[PDB]
């Protein structure tokens, strides 16, 4: 299963010019496009080789869409500040995430189109792609505005038609990076806490996609209460890293096992110091 997801960020900055609009687009965990309204000559920019060889008409159209979206978000930020009776001096953020999930059959599983204001849910398109859920009164104003405009019909058209077509085209053109799984290379490290304790750290390096599970077991039972788990992090090369760590008594290291689960692994993976 695969997804194409766009992430838009608009940020006001009173007294310091017009709001800045930023967009990034992803297929699964791989970014392919960026736009920044504050750049010298703002244009849609490739971030992946499988869209770099799209023609000039493609890139000109993306660029024009982002430019229009930035303008639209400027008006949205102003309207929202009014709905909430917020003061002129504050900086505010409007975020939009939209896209399409493809099921294992290659068919549309879920389209989504949802918004946040100041980091908090504002309005979202329901899974039926026909109706809206507003999170507060202010958002009810947008809901009636969009219901009157038949906005949802336009978003549905994109989500069921155009969104899937793009994603299927990218999956094919970028199959060498998009349709692959790099399994994690795994190792345990050992760090004396003292003379009586030591940290055991289980590492997963260089995997793709980002989804993974690391778990620490002792003689069989999971070590939920005592596991320190960092968030999965980008290596910088298109792969990801994660670690899981436990503090164990000195001399009892051998009783602990680290369990790694990932799409790319050929078999169950067990590690032990």
């Amino acid at each position: 299963s695969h997804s194409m997801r766009y992430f838009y960020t608009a940020v006001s900055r009173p007294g310091r010019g017009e709001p800045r609009f930023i967009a990034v687009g992803y297929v699964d965990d791989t970014q392919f496009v960026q736009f920044d309204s504050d750049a010298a000559s703002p244009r849609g920019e490739p971030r992946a080789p499988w869209v770099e060889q799209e023609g000039p008409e493609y890139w000109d159209r993306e660029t024009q869409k982002y430019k229009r979206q930035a303008q639209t978000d400027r008006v949205s930020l102003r309207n929202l500040r009014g709905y909430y009776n917020q003061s002129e001096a504050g900086s505010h953020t409007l975020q939009r995430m939209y896209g399409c999930d493809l099921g294992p059959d290659g068919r549309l599983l879920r389209g989504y189109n949802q918004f946040a204001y100041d980091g908090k849910d504002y309005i979202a398109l329901n899974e039926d792609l026909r109706s809206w859920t507003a999170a507060d009164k202010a958002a009810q104003i947008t809901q009636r505005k969009w219901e009157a405009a038949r906005e949802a019909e336009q978003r549905r058209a994109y989500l069921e038609g155009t969104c899937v077509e793009w994603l299927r085209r990218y999956l094919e053109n970028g199959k060498k990076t998009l349709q692959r799984a790099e399994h994690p290379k795994t190792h345990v490290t050992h760090h004396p806490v003292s003379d009586h304790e030591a940290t055991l750290r289980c590492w997963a390096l260089g995997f793709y996609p980002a989804e993974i599970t690391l778990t620490w077991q002792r003689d069989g039972e999971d070590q939920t209460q005592d596991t320190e788990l960092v968030e999965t992090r980008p290596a910088g090369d298109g792969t990801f890293q994660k670690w899981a760590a436990v503090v164990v008594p000195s001399g009892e290291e051998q009783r602990y096992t680290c369990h790694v689960q990932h799409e790319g692994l050929p078999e169950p993976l067990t590690l032990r110091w």
Binding site: Y6, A23, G25, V33, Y58, R61, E62, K65, Y66, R68, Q69, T72, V75, S76, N79, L80, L94, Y98, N113, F115, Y122, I123, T142, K145, W146, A149, E151, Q154, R155, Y158, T162, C163, W166
Partner: peptide
């Protein structure tokens, strides 16, 4: 390919 633009909030 991004969505085309609709109405302001």
């Amino acid at each position: 390919g991004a969505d085309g633009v609709g109405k302001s909030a």
